[PDB]
Design a protein around this nucleic acid. Structure first.
Lengths: 185, 171, 257
RNA sequence: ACUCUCUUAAGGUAGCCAAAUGCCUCGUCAUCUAAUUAGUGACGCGCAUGAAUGGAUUAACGAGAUUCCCACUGUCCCUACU
RNA sequence: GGAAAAACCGUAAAUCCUAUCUUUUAAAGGAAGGAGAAGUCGUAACAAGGUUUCCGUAGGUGAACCUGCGGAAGGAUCAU
RNA sequence: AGCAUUUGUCUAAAAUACUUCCAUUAAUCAAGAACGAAAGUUAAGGGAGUGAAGACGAUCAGAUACCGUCGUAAUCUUAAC
RNA sequence: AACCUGGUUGAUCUUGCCAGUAGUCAUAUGCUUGUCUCAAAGAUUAAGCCAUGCAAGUGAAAGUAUAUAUAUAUAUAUGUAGAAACUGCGAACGGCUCAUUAAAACAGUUAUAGUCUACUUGACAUUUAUAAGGAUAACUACGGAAAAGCUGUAGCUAAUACUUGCAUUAUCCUUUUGGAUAAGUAUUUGUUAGAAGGAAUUAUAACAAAGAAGUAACACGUAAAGUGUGUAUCAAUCGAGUUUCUGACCUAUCAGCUUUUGAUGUUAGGGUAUUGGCCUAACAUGGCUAUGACGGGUAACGGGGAAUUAGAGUUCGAUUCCGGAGAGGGAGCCUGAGAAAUAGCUACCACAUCUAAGGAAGGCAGCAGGCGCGUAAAUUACCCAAUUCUAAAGAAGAGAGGUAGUGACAAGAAAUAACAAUGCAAGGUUUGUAUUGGAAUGGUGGGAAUUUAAAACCUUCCCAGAGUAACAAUUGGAGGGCAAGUCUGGUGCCAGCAGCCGCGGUAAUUCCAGCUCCAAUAGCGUAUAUUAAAAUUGUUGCAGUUAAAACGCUCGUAGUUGAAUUUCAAAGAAUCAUUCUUUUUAAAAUCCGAUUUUGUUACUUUGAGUAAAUUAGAGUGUUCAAAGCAAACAGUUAAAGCAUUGUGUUUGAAUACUAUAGCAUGGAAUAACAAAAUUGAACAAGCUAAAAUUUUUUGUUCUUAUUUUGGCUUAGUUACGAUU
């Protein structure tokens, strides 16, 4: 019989293909955050949009309503965990206020570029794919990992990376130089 | 057989699917006549055993008014409530009117009270007049086709009058 | 043909079995026995999926062959045998006694019980029949037949029952001051005091139940289990004592540890 | 269709058909049949159709004319007996 | 006590005959609609379109149509 | 739809007026029905004028048309459609 | 994201369509394809046909072993194995398809006081015996037939198979006790008597008749007295049949259908497991229908649900679960608790295999695999380890099921460089870009570590191991719609393109190329269907003077819609100035001067009782995500807690929704409806017939008599009685 494991679309295709202002804006966003495809923007956009929809539904419901207080607080707490909303804000209209650069700012590649390590957004993206990064206690190669607030304090190098001091350099060149030196001497 | 494949309440001809199920049954009908006791075992659904009497003659007959029973040979079938065919053919069915040999009852009464429990309810003259001539009108109550024996009661009073009038204006 | 159905799909099995989506395809189907299918657990689930003394059905079979499990004072032998709404599970190797109870979310937990209280159980009577020679007998939700019951005990009264003799020690009236436990309704797995009885001709009868936090809910008479008299519950209740937190508070409590 | 032309009292309209009306003719095309000078439907420059000399169609009716099909049979094979 | 065999009701497959319905589908000839070209004959409609148009209706005609009867203005007049 | 001479007879109608009566009886309405110009049909009368048809004379390259002269059916009453 | 543009014209504004756009767990197909996870897959066409192979069996204390094998102690004792076979239990579930089928089946919702129910559970039984009767298999012998899961004789022999059949307890009396007497479970009849349910012709108790069936002539060795197997009745249970209510697609160019042949009812039967025209007989003459019956259509199994949605919605649902239906077409049957069973059976028809021709055997919509049909679809794989089932139940079986193989059906994650130097470029030591040149790394090849039923993959580690990082990104476009070329050649109204408008007749911004540029990207085109866009199907929410569209006109039945009116208010506290909340204010009945009840229904509120998967949704760093339903914590190995020298500890798997119908429930408004004057009451008085209360005639029991309460006949008395 068919498998019971679920699956879902991450993203929604954009409608109205060639709308100039939107198109140029998307390119501009790619320019800043180093994403490969319009698809990466669209998944992030879809994710934001779902949050906005949920918050919108919640804000229609009346104050002091039991479901509303519970779900709204829970969603907002999840936003705090994500690092989308600051401490001072705590109200659903700041959830509505969430905005697409603010969300991109919480990508792991962005966080690395800001913290250092790499010298470029693009450099950070390749560095993450080539397995040099670590969130502390766990290693990751996915540049679309999003950073939670309690994990922003432990970005590091991977301990099995060259920069971690593992196998220390290029095997080829170092061996060739050592063999030549031994032969020569 | 049972419960479908006949017309809709509207008068419509309802369609059929669902080929006949065993639990419908509709088992073949049994006559049963007057002769020498002969009975066949039937195996009904869920291992319910039933008894098919195909011939009988000797029943359990009750005088209701005194609440007592004696076993008696049944002389003849004389009237049936439904079709005339069953009585003509000499076949028994539940509500049928037979005649019983009254000597057991007569004997019982003479032994118990004297003269030809809740004592002395005083017979009835019409019934008594029948009683002298020694063969008395009775209604079978049990179901021969189910129970393998035919058991009944002596007719009385108003019921007696009704059956006598119908049975025998008069042709 | 068109016989009885002996299989049970894992998805189609009750939610309160608490089985996963991806673990094979068929559940244990409970054998016929002293409690209804939808209102029990099969012994396999109890041993493997709840207690975790087996990782496989096979290990359950190995455990069961050994006469070290006893339910209701007697050894059991079939894997698919029902645990029952109120009973005593005794695991003889490690000397452990469990009484089976509902939590406050709607599923069965095996609850650690002392040796002394382990020798009795609580039986709801469902019916009382008059059998030959004018001798009454009561009929329990525990599937068990009770000879020579008091005429003072009626249909919704529960009864405390020994496990050595199978005879009655005492009984708890269904009087409107008695502790009641909810067995299968929407609000299953709660305890309250019985506020009020409403009797409806030809139809379902509803009873209003009050919580220890003074919250009120109603429930259908069919699924109401008397559990003590106003002094105390007559068996030891599990951790949350039949009292249900409301969701907001529950989540607030969970965080605040 | 359209045009010219001689000419009539007027130049066959609505219809209709190789019809009991068609010489040429067993007309041409279908269809019925195994083979159709027969039957039926079409077609119609029609020797020589056609509007109370009635035209066209018709339900019912026919000791009417005509063809085919089914049933049936000594009509026939092929006669025999009485 | 009992196998073979039969007869009767009752289930009732199946085979054939009609009858109706259903579905495509053939057919001489008839008669439409469209598509295609630079073909023929006209001048019908648009202007008072050179007889105002159009309606309903009936008859006629080579076709576009014309004519009768009664309407309409979407008429060419909102008016002594 | 339609209805214009005179008087009579039989009919309906609406408005107004009304310190008159009834007390929601209503509104619009598939179904169904009544009436329904003109032409046309069927039948009897009737038949002046008008006048599809048709016949001619013209006009036109042609005219089965516009125009002209004559002219059946219809146009009128009764009775049906 | 509750969205629009191009096309009627010389130019314009409308109406209106067509064209574009996006999606589509929705199929096909074209090109290309490096990774990794995830995983649909011969349904639409033929419920068409099938070669070969496999797909249901079963014995670990415990019915039957002189086939046979074997270990201990002294031919004997015990035992232990055991091919074979009877017997037992299953094989009636699964799995598959979706042809049939439109009040049918199905979903919710009843009912079963109308019934059946194996395994399992708990109660628990009544009218020769130190141990009974055969007859049969395997087996032995002789055999037959081309061949079949063919079977003939004759001789044997067992069973928990088949078949007989053996006490003893209870009731009444003197009075621990001494006597006497009874003694059939269901089932069925007749007669009565009468712990519960809303209601009993019910449980039940008695009397008089019949009466199945049973209550161990069975096997182990269990507790430092037990178990198996069989067994009557009851209950429970796994369930099943009927059965109440309410809910559906298209069609009126289907309007009257149904009743001899049961249609609708009544009575009586028969039949059923039981109710019933379920079936027979007799009798009624009904039942259904424009609120759409009866037909026809459906490329229609139903539902859970799926896609698309701002909100309404519209389309889809062969297909994971539930339920139904069926096994080539029909029909009929046996066994058994359960079957009108299809890897049970018999026959016919339609197909069709073997045959020496006499006869025999057959049913893939089980899994593979083949043919055909087609637009359209995978291995004659490996394994019972998990998941479960069946068995005489650990240990055996299972193409149920898992695991791989095939797999660009879908879905998630993700490479195809990065970077520093210089040189050049542009900016007010900057930003950009062609020279160089050391680092970083998968993909990949090999070995392992591991994983695993077994192997492979995954992950992990160690070797190898990029510069034209040739370890080479494609697809479709570039007038408008619509983002990007009035660039370069060829063609020359041809070839062609072009969804649409249009382009192509010698400068083609559209063809055919090349160059450049652009969109999306390991994916992108095309076709067909379908949803949005479509407020172009319009309830929300259209249009009808003239664009499409007011019936010629009126009456009128169904339908839909329908004036006003019967209980107005007053006071207090909280809170920021409003808001929310409480009190009292007519009248009758009822309960001890005080206390509490008062039309029906719609409507509405709460509730109850609701399968999960799905879906919304809380919790949870699967490496991330798609996901999953888990997990977390301390500890180089012990602390800590708590148990009376022992024991890891905290745990999570919420919540909601689950028609409109049905169920309970508070209600003031809004609606209905009931009640409602050619008259109808309400009460006080009196007479009268029914019941209750007190008394009681007479030697095992028949009467009678006063009093009191409800019903009825007859004058009075009331704010007596009708909204505008």
């Amino acid at each position: 019989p068919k498998s019971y494991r679920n699956y879902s679309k991450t993203a929604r295709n954009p409608k109205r293909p060639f709308e100039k202002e939107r198109l140029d804006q998307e390119l501009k966003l790619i320019g800043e955050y180093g994403l490969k495809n319009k698809r990466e923007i669209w998944r992030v956009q879809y994710l934001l949009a779902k949050i906005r929809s949920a918050a919108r539904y919640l804000l229609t419901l009346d104050e002091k309503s039991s479901k509303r207080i519970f779900q709204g607080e829970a969603l907002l707490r999840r936003m705090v965990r994500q690092g989308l909303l600051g401490e001072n804000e705590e109200k659903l209209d700041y959830v509505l206020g969430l905005t697409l650069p603010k969300l991109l700012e919480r990508r792991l590649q962005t966080k690395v570029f800001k913290l250092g390590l790499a010298k470029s957004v693009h450099h950070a993206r390749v560095l993450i794919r080539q397995r040099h990064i670590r969130v502390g206690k766990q290693m990751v190669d996915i540049p679309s990992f999003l950073v939670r607030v309690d994990s922003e304090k432990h970005i590091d190098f991977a301990t099995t990376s060259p920069f971690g001091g593992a196998r220390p350099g290029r095997v080829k060149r170092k061996s060739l130089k050592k063999q030549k030196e031994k032969t020569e001497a | 057989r049972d419960g479908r494949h006949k017309l809709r309440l509207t008068g419509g001809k309802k369609k059929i699917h669902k080929k006949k199920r065993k639990y419908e049954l509709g088992r073949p009908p049994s006559n049963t006549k007057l002769g020498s006791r002969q009975v066949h075992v039937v195996r009904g659904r869920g291992r319910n055993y039933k008894y098919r009497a195909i011939k009988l003659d000797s029943g359990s007959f009750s005088w209701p008014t005194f609440g007592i029973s004696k076993n008696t040979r049944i002389i003849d079938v004389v009237y049936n409530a439904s079709n005339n065919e069953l009585v003509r053919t000499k076949t028994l069915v539940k509500n049928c009117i037979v005649v019983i040999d009254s000597h057991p009852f007569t004997t019982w009464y003479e032994n118990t009270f004297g003269t030809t429990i809740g004592k002395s309810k005083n017979i009835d003259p019409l019934l008594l007049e029948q009683f002298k001539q020694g063969r008395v009108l009775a209604c079978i109550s049990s179901r021969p086709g189910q129970c393998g024996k035919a058991d009944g009661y002596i007719i009385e009073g108003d019921e007696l009058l009704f059956y006598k009038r119908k049975m025998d204006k008069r042709n | 043909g068109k016989g009885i159905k002996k299989h049970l799909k894992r998805v189609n099995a009750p939610s309160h079995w608490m089985l996963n989506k991806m673990g094979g395809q068929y559940a244990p189907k409970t054998s016929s026995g002293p409690h209804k299918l939808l209102e029990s657990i099969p012994l396999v689930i109890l041993l493997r999926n709840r207690l975790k003394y087996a990782l496989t059905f096979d290990e359950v079979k190995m455990i069961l062959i050994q006469k070290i499990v006893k339910v209701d004072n007697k050894v059991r032998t079939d894997c698919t045998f029902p645990v029952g709404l109120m009973d005593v599970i005794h695991i003889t190797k490690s000397n452990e006694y469990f009484r089976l109870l509902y939590d406050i979310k709607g599923r069965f937990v095996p609850h650690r019980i002392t040796n002394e209280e382990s020798k009795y159980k609580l039986c709801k009577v469902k019916k009382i029949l008059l059998r030959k020679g004018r001798l009454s007998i009561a009929v329990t939700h525990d599937g068990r037949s009770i000879p020579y019951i008091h005429p003072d005990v009626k249909v919704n009264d529960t009864v405390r029952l020994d496990l050595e003799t199978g005879k009655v020690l005492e009984h708890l009236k269904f009087q409107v001051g008695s502790l009641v436990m909810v067995t299968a309704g929407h609000s299953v797995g709660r305890v309250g005091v019985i506020s009020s009885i409403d009797k409806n001709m030809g139809t379902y009868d509803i009873i209003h139940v009050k919580d220890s936090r003074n919250k009120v809910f109603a429930t259908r008479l069919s699924n109401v289990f008397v559990i003590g008299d106003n002094t105390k519950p007559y068996i030891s209740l599990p951790r949350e004592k039949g009292i249900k937190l409301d969701i907001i508070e529950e989540r607030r409590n969970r965080l605040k540890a």
